[PDB]
């Protein structure tokens, strides 16, 4: 009834041609070549993000709608795309990420980008029952696509849910995936959030239409309902008139080494668990 729910039930009627022209119509791309090279190669010493995803939280800071800054909490870290693009920055103390790293799950993979010592992965780890700590900026990437979309929407709330548990008074800065926003408890847990904690909600343009997706992020202030609308109406658009064409920019990279804010004993000890 609502136009996400719309946009879902036409995606999933799509032929393959269609669908793949549709997925890639005038998203933006960055293109994973190289690091794809050096990861199947298994170099450490190339500045290259570990996973795509790390284009999003790069547009998410760039844009300023996210300020990275203290001890970094990755919650769903997978691979690390997240937790390493945020040890590279200049206001960022600690990085930790936490993921499952079970069956059919990513583990996080070793690499020595800039700001790799002060990283710490931990995988066997259910971020939604292990126990919280502080930070002040919390990410959290989290929210499994399914055909049934209210498999979507509990996932989204269970998400949501838990980063109200996670957040301290002294998380500033945030960003949380809201894998189907446009459910009415979805939409109605986003403002009950926005009322205590403020920040507002973005698409990020490097989603593929084949996903809602949007963030849930401190930086803007913003109308939750217009916002995921203006989202599902230019999902639908694209839809109508699907151009087959994304923009390509370039990757994620990164300089190497470590940062000051050195124990390479315990650093070694580090990168051999992982
Ligand atoms: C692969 S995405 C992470 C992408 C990441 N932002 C990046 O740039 O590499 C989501 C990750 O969250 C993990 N995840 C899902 N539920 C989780 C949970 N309850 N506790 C910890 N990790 C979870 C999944 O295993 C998955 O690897």
Not at 17 to 25: A, D, L
Request: proline share 3%; charged share 25%; aromatic share 8%.
């Amino acid at each position: 009834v609502t136009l996400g729910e719309v946009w879902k039930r036409q995606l999933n009627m799509l032929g393959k041609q269609e669908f793949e022209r549709y997925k890639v119509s005038d998203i933006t791309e960055v293109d994973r070549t190289a690091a794809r090279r050096y990861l199947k190669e298994g170099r450490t010493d190339v500045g290259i993000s570990v996973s795509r995803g790390a284009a999003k939280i790069r547009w998410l800071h760039e844009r300023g709608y996210l300020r990275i800054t203290g001890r970094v909490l990755d919650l769903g870290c997978g691979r690390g795309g997240w937790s390493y693009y945020a040890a590279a920055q200049k206001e960022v103390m600690s990085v930790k990420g936490y993921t499952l790293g079970i069956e059919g799950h990513e583990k996080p993979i070793h690499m020595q980008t800039l700001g790799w010592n002060i990283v710490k992965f931990k995988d066997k780890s259910n971020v939604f029952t292990m126990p919280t700590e502080p930070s002040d900026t919390l990410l959290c990437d989290i929210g499994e696509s399914s055909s049934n979309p209210l498999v979507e929407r509990d996932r989204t709330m269970k998400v949501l849910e838990n980063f109200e548990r996670w957040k301290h008074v002294n998380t500033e800065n945030f960003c949380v995936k809201v894998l189907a926003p446009y459910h009415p408890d979805v939409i109605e847990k986003l403002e009950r959030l926005q009322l205590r904690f403020g920040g507002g909600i973005v698409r990020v343009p490097f989603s593929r239409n084949s996903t809602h997706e949007m963030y849930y992020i401190s930086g803007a202030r913003n109308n939750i309902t217009h916002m995921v609308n203006t989202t599902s109406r230019s999902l639908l658009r694209r839809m109508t008139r699907p151009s087959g064409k994304a923009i390509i920019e370039g990757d994620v990279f990164l300089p190497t080494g470590t940062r000051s804010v050195i124990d390479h004993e315990a650093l070694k000890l580090r990168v051999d668990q992982i």
